[PDB]
Amino acid sequence: AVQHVVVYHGTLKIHCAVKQFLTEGIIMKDFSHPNVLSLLGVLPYMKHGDLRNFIRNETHNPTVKDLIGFGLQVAKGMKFVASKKFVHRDLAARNCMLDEKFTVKVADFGLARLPVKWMALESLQTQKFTTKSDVWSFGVLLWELMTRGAPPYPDVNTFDITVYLLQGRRLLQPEYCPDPLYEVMLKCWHPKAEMRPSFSELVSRISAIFSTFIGEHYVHVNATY
Numbered sequence: 001a002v003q004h005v006v007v008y009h010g011t012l013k014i015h016c017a018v019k020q021f022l023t024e025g026i027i028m029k030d031f032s033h034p035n036v037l038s039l040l041g042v043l044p045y046m047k048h049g050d051l052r053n054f055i056r057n058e059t060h061n062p063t064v065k066d067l068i069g070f071g072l073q074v075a076k077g078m079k080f081v082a083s084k085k086f087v088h089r090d091l092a093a094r095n096c097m098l099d100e101k102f103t104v105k106v107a108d109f110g111l112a113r114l115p116v117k118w119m120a121l122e123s124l125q126t127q128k129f130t131t132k133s134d135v136w137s138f139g140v141l142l143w144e145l146m147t148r149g150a151p152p153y154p155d156v157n158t159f160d161i162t163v164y165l166l167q168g169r170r171l172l173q174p175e176y177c178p179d180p181l182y183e184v185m186l187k188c189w190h191p192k193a194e195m196r197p198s199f200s201e202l203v204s205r206i207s208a209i210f211s212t213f214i215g216e217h218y219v220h221v222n223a224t225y
C-alpha cells in the first residue's frame, strides 16, 4: 500500500524539495488538488516559497486583484481539504506556497506539519479544532493578504487575545481591502461557528469579488506594520 507512494534540493525532469510515517505517506499521497501541496512520492519545489514572505517582499508589486486571487486559491484548496473531512489547524499565509506559475498551494499538513492569533474563539477556549475554526483562520489569512503580510493584532500579546476578542473586537479593515471582502472576513469570524460560511460559500463569494477587479490598484506596505 505504501509501495505506490515510493528541507533539501533534488531532481525527479521535476525539481524537488525534501524534509505511522508510511500510513500518513499514503494519506498525504491521495490528496490531489492544484491548490494543495503534493507529495511526489519529497514535495515539489515551490519557486516562490511561502505566501507571507512573497507578499512582504518590497520588490513585488501585487495588485488588489492579485491578492484576492491568492485568497481565492487558498479557499479552493480548503474547499477540497474540507471535502475530505480534514481539518488543517494551522491555516496562515506562512503555510501556503507559491510555484513558478504563482499558483498557491496550501501546505504545512501531514508529514510536512499554538497559532493563537489565527485561532477561532471557541478553539482558544476548548483547544479543539474544526472546519469552522479553519474558516476563522482563513479570515485572518485574507487580512494578511490585504496588509501584505502584516502581523495580526500587533500590540496584542499572544496570551491576551481571547480577552481582547471577548471585549467585542476584530481585526480592522486594511487600507487596501475592498468593503465586500471585509464583510467576508467579518463572516469568517462570526462568534457562532455554525454561522460562518463554508469554504464552498467562500470560493463563491470571493470569485465574484475577484472578477470586479482589473489589476489597476497597487497595494502598498503600511509604515506602522
Ligand SMILES: O=C(NCCN1CCOCC1)Nc1nc2ccc(Sc3nnc4ccc(-c5ccc(F)cc5)nn34)cc2s1
Binding pocket: 007, 017, 019, 043, 044, 045, 046, 047, 048, 049, 050, 053, 094, 095, 096, 097, 107, 108, 109, 112, 113
Ligand atoms: O524556498 C523555496 N523557494 C525559494 C524562496 N526564495 C526566498 C527568497 O526569495 C526568492 C524565493 N521553495 C520551497 N519549496 C518548498 C517546499 C516545501 C517546503 S517544507 C513545507 N511544507 N509545508 C510548508 C509550509 C510552509 C513552509 C515554509 C514556511 C516559511 C518559510 F520561510 C519557508 C517555508 N514550508 N513548508 C519548503 C519549501 S521552500
